[PDB]
Write a protein that binds this ligand. Structure first.
Ligand SMILES: Nc1ncnc2c1ncn2[C@@H]1O[C@H](COP(=O)(O)OP(=O)(O)OP(O)(O)=S)[C@@H](O)[C@H]1O
Ligand SMILES: Nc1ncnc2c1ncn2[C@@H]1O[C@H](COP(=O)(O)OP(=O)(O)OP(O)(O)=S)[C@@H](O)[C@H]1O
Ligand SMILES: Nc1ncnc2c1ncn2[C@@H]1O[C@H](COP(=O)(O)OP(=O)(O)OP(O)(O)=S)[C@@H](O)[C@H]1O
Ligand SMILES: [Mg+2]
Ligand SMILES: [Mg+2]
Ligand SMILES: [Mg+2]
Lengths: 432, 432, 432, 432
DNA sequence: TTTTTTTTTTTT
């Protein structure tokens, strides 16, 4: 029914107002229909009005396509004529036609991706998406229903807004009291929280301590280590949970009986979730890789995480920018934005680590301007905490956590407090 | 499109009043088109009015043509109808047709000049110009645009200019006396206004404060969130309007009774406007999306916004340049130009935020050179204020606002003024 | 007469010494002639001497030519002979032939340009000059001659040097005596003058001050703006000439009676010109449009320009390069060249205002390595000034001018001088 | 080519004496070419002289030749002419022919060696070299060059080198006795020599003086100015040559009669050179534009300079640095290297000027450490004279010349000398 | 050819 759609795009102002915002060039044909719609779209972009038959003929004469295409477009334009119709049958039929064409294009692209990925490398016609984003494309084929959400009205829609304040399902409480106090109830789902410490100051000890604390509070935690292996992170978690020093495990001061007893005692407790550690090579995982990991975890292991942790965003690969194409600023900003998009998609608290510049190392204070790889990371991150350690603090078994970007509350209040990091047990303890 | 031009010359006075000044027999053709235009020109010269079909046919009978030309003119005259096409498209198309025909005639003329130059001096014609007249014959053919307006005169139009001085309909007050004082009556419609600061300083706080202030004045405000979600921002607007807190909303200190009472009391006010909050994924919107959103808003609800707030220009996506086609100085400036064009098209006050590079994130002052993105943004901008907060300022809850680019008024009359920013209420308070 | 040219290039020495530096491969037809000239040129480049017949037959055998090309070149070489003629008819005939070939090539190139322009976007060739570049090409072809001036030859060009000593070019005086001192009487007719400055520091203030000063001297001034409405520029001029602050005009302190009285008092003065302000959209005007504008200004308004002032060079259209085709440097250089050509053609002092880079903003000193868009502007310009009102000159109500490039005198004599900028009246007063 | 080689072996002497030692029978052919060379070699052996074409025919008349060979030889002998080709092209072309034939023979020999190697060991030729001899054989093919000149060979070019020391082949005198004394006979070709302008001490005056002494000695001088026009520099040259004061020309004291008389008096003298002044914009002339200028002057003006004087090194631009700066060290170091490379590749004496540190300005003594260009100019400069001015030197019309770097001779021999500077005539006179 | 981030280095 392409002829009817074009005719009522021309000879119906009411029809054009609703269907146009959604009409696209890939929904008609590879011949006369697409060319006619391209003519109409160019005229609309140039004059912001629906062209007439004379305007279409003039644009057709000032066009460069061949004789066959010219004749087809001329016949199609000559066949366009308004008919007595009703707005509803046309809008519903157009929605059905657009949905069918979107599904057809999506399945054609799916077949193309499958037949392209099944090719020897270096001859796979790059810039074509991989099989990993096969379902997502189909998800885009179903989100076309002529029902775009205009937005949220402050006065018209306030009961629904008020039924989001006492819900509190968005906030995931910590286990430390100070972190809950500064965040006013803990971190929120669909966010990107960051730890900035430097090199060998913490920043993975803190992530492991957070993972252990969330695990004790009945949470499913997905640790993703882009550098350290799976047994080192698991060893850190074991040291945190079992209250056994990493030196004791290395020096064999803990027996198999004690280890088994502690593990079974933790297992028999109802207030304990599941922690899963996954390792990827440095620069070999992205947002799409994490989504594939999420899907295979949900299917194979029936594991649905809420506290997804990534060891370092700077070590991950952007899923949109080719490697080493853009500078550190753009690449890191894109990676952080994609991670935040993943977090809001799966509705999980995302925790990450970030390096500071060389000038901030061995300094008694770390500012937000000391971020290493990009200034956009603080802009695209919900909460950031700076971990500072000096010789005096190290001798006191304490670290100073400074609130650098506090989006859940006022950062001026409680800006710097001293945590009791214990490096042997990979644990954070409070001083209150 | 000679038929359209002749038909709208005869049957349209508005078209005749803008194209007849620039029209010649050489522009049309050498056959029936030129003869028809010559008949029209002869009739308008003998009688100062546009001829009719009957008068044109009578003149054709009076005038003498050979059989072929007579038949061609009769056939062409038979093909004239009103056909009320758009005026803008018609004038643009006739300008293009005139330009292309003039270029063709100029090329033929210079080719004839070159051919005559090679002839021996005895054989060559003295009427044709020398080769030295080739260039100006070309530039003049490139100065046949349709524009009869010459511009202001400063001595013949001072009365109209004085009347224009009294047209203050472009101004929009600020609800803040200091901002009105420094803008000489508030912001103006169709202008790009920017509120820039560092990361986590209160850019979105200022945007929401401006939205609430415009809402309390009866304006229609369209808040477009790029990083935050739609609901979170409405909470800030509620904290500004209801004037309780941000934490008290999340800590349950407000019962439903008070919330309902305050919302209904604000509904009873006749000085309140309409506020719509729209969220977009990072890097997925521009004026092209904004124009479709405007059309959908106007269709679905009686909402034509007077104020358009964009959460951040940087997070926005340029229309023509791809996601990472060019560097920051280009696409950021392109987005700024597109936003200003959208504002001047919709005649709305456009507000947006801008980021500051790391060099001024901890400085007591910020200059125009401290713009994180392209420096073309402080070229398309009109009132680029700046927010500077220090430890002493945060102690007194008083952000410093520095006038960075002031196109409305004197940038240095009140260069730096203190505000009374309340972070809990997301409100700017004037200081007296 | 290609055969004669080749024959006397090979067999004659004075002819070779006279005509060789001006010969080019494009002056010969694509048959045997161009290939033979290629062989001759390669031999001359490799051995710095005129080849013989044996040399070329050796070069022909050691060449990658097809059978047809080989046969044609061999036949042409066989046909060459030393016909005795006079070395005063040969040189002029060769010059005529070269000029004709250059004109033919230019005609073909402009025909190709016009064919390329009419093609739709995404199919048309890029980097090919637009239609507005056609006359310039035709200006280059007519300049071909066997006489070339590379540098100034002492003892060979000394009459012209004595003329330059004794004669001085006519100057359009300023009203500020300091500019006359630094320019030795003012600015010449066919010049491009630029007043670079930072953003929101007085680019339009200085241009409007110059426009008012020239208007008070009896000149016809055309003010073309792109970032400002006609009423705004005319209000700046009124503030300059009526001695009323822009604050007074906006606030309504002055009445219509006083305004009319002052305007009529200015009208009654005989030493007054005509100032016409024309506004164009950003990127919507070029040199041809300025020419079309000057055309209607000379016709509709019957006004001949004298001090054409382009508010901003960086906004105007290229007129030689398609929009968004080349980089900023090339486009701005092309705009500068087009504007200077327009000034030379119209014999009008042309004043403009470019923007300095972000580094020069709030910098107490600027140099040629501070221009933002293009560093080729000083080469095209004839006088270039700067504005250095950075931090403390604004508090003292003063400015500073660097004199970056002054072709009228010596830049290192009064390089930096202080200007009393008054922003309420939008004028420059002298510190003397 | 073989016909030409044989013809110019028979009918030339220098070509024979140059190419005979590198001529072998296997280089020509297996029919006419080889047999004909065999005749030349045979005769050259029995009678140590070149045979007459008839004597070569006598060789054919008295030699073992098959009917085809004897005929072939007769035709080839009858096809040899005494035509006069240029010697350089002939030698180069016969060298290329010999090299190609030697390479072909060596490749065929190694192919035959490989083919013989892949044969039954009982059945193979013993005379064929083993496979291990293949790399050496090709070497003998690559070691074929009519003339071997790779660098300067000590103990093999000592006689030519002595002729350089006695004839002072590299020195260019100065016309000033003191400058000749400290340079052991003047500056050398392929060198960069700079004068360290101090506190407003000078600006082109010295280089203009150097552009007159060389002119009076018969040298072709190319003066490239950046901060001045051609007329101004040539006026400084006229002041020095015509003894007219610089201000007298501007005032008009000297009339056209005296000027023309002095110019013609200079033109009569045969000891006068040519001066070509070329102007370039500031920063618009790298040391690659100078190469193009030299090529144009050689091709069109036939002007091949021996002295190149650049007005100022700092004003110049680096050929491939992209970013230019008003006063940056990296650019000055690159500019010096590029200019010295130009001097070396053009075998010309290159002169330029550069600024020095304020300390060098305040102190009468200037140290290499006290130089604006540190480790950049006293590293790429063969000679660096420090021209500084003092009020006492000024009151006596003198300038103290100090020698800061002298590759030519000992720097401490005559380091300080007083120069008689005349600022009106722009001249340097000696002091007794 | 400019523009902007980050880093590292070096020169004054
Ligand atoms: N096996 C271990 N036994 C005891 N202490 C350890 C051990 N591993 C690490 N630590 C301590 O933990 C501190 C911080 O460890 P990490 O969390 O690995 O630092 P890091 O910042 O993650 O390293 P990078 O540079 O970011 S990969 C170190 O400085 C050590 O003092
Ligand atoms: N929900 C909140 N509760 C309390 N304080 C907040 C909240 N959100 C933001 N703030 C404070 O508001 C200030 C700036 O935060 P925002 O206004 O959200 O920043 P923004 O303008 O979005 O800029 P960035 O660069 O994106 S953080 C800081 O003092 C924050 O701590
Ligand atoms: N209405 C006004 N009243 C008083 N002063 C004003 C007014 N408008 C502008 N100014 C002042 O004039 C100065 C120069 O403004 P402009 O003439 O627009 O300079 P500009 O370089 O053209 O700015 P652009 O075009 O946005 S880069 C500003 O910095 C203000 O201080
Ligand atoms: Mg780590
Ligand atoms: Mg923000
Ligand atoms: Mg301006």
């Amino acid at each position: 029914m392409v002829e009817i759609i074009l005719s009522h795009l021309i000879f119906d102002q009411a029809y054009f107002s609703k269907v146009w915002p959604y009409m696209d060039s890939e929904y008609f044909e590879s011949g006369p229909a697409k060319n006619t719609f391209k003519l109409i779209k160019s005229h609309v972009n140039e004059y912001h009005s629906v062209p007439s038959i004379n305007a279409l003929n003039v644009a057709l004469e000032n066009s460069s396509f061949t004789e066959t295409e010219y004749s087809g477009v001329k016949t199609l334009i000559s066949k366009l004529a308004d008919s007595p119709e009703d707005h509803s049958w046309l809008v519903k039929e157009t929605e059905k036609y657009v949905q069918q064409r979107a599904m057809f294009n999506a399945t054609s692209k799916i077949i193309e991706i499958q037949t392209n990925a099944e090719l020897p490398p270096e001859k796979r016609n790059k810039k074509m998406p991989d099989v990993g984003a096969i379902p997502d494309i189909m998800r885009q084929a179903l989100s076309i229903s002529f029902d775009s959400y205009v937005g949220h009205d402050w006065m018209d829609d306030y009961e629904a807004r008020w039924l989001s304040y006492m819900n509190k399902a968005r906030k995931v409480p910590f286990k430390l009291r100070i972190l809950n106090k500064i965040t006013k109830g803990g971190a929120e789902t669909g966010t990107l929280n960051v730890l900035m410490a430097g090199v060998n100051v913490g920043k993975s000890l803190g992530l492991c301590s957070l993972a252990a604390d969330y695990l004790q509070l009945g949470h499913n935690v997905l640790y993703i280590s882009m550098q350290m292996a799976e047994e080192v992170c698991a060893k850190r978690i074991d040291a945190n949970m079992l209250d056994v020093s990493l030196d004791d495990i290395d020096d064999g001061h803990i027996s198999y009986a004690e280890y088994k007893g502690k593990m079974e005692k933790w297992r028999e407790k109802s207030t304990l979730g599941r922690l899963i550690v996954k390792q990827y090579p440095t620069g070999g995982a992205d947002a799409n890789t994490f989504r594939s990991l999420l899907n295979e975890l949900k299917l194979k292991k029936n594991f649905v995480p809420t506290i997804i942790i990534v060891d370092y965003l700077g070590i991950c690969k952007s899923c949109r920018i080719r490697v080493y194409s853009e500078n550190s600023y753009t690449t890191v900003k894109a990676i952080a934005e994609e991670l935040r998009a993943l977090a809001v998609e799966t509705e999980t608290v995302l925790w990450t680590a970030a390096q500071v510049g060389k000038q901030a190392w061995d300094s008694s204070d770390v500012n937000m301007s000391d971020i290493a790889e990009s200034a956009g990371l603080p802009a695209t991150a919900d909460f950031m905490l700076a971990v500072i350690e000096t010789e005096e603090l190290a001798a006191a078994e304490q670290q100073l956590i400074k609130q650098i970007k506090s989006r859940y509350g006022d950062k001026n209040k409680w800006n710097k407090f001293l945590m009791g990091v214990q490096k042997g047990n990979q644990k954070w303890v409070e001083i209150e």
